[PDB]
Amino acid sequence: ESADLRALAKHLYDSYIKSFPLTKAKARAILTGKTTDKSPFVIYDMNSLMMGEDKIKFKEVAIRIFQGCQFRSVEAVQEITEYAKSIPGFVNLDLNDQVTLLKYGVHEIIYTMLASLMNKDGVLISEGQGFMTREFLKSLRKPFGDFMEPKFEFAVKFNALELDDSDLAIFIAVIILSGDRPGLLNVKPIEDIQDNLLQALELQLKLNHPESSQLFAKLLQKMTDLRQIVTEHVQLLQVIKKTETDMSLHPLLQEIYKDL
């Protein structure tokens, strides 16, 4: 029954709005500078960065940025975990599997949702109060200048799908309930949940984007781009650990990160 699938879509969208304070709808309102209810402050060089603290609520500059990214990721992990517990069936899973599903799903979600905050010229920061240009980030000293480029490239393509928050809420639930994560103890109940989530996403895209042929398939193919961003980023962090011997990765992020 599609009524049951529409009910699940509504439930997940409701829970997404409650869990993620900065939605895509709000990010696009900020970025499309027609909606000038509150415009962001734009950080494009070293002096604009230095004035950003004077307006936004805010040791090398590449480092200070890198820690802002980590801190935002820690906050995102907390939001995703709260979202995860609303996915019907998730909290009834073996706790070791719950932990495993979050450990591998969190970064794929973070870059999915980071795309909502991006256009081809930069990224919103600090709850949309700021905008950091892609050029400025690319100008950071090695290896920090290479950190953000594959995210922008992913986002440009991902954003061409024109998903909205109600689509993304189900897609993110599909990502979390992936039965193919390493170390899972009971794959079958995870797969049963993901099958129902996939039926829901499929109907959602049909109803919400009836003119977008094979959007469902094109979205599922994006899960390949996501896994590739994660791998690249893990290697980039290993270079950081060896050159930045005075730099600390947040312990929550440290725990999530386990290579291979």
Ligand SMILES: Cc1oc(-c2ccccc2)nc1CCC(=O)c1ccc(/C=C2\SC(=O)NC2=O)cc1
């Ligand atoms: C580019 C930028 O700068 C700032 C900022 C904020 C406050 C002060 C100064 C700068 N906010 C952003 C936007 C979000 C950012 O683009 C991002 C967030 C998380 C991950 C995921 C990572 S990064 C890691 O080391 N571990 C992770 O899990 C990647 C990128």
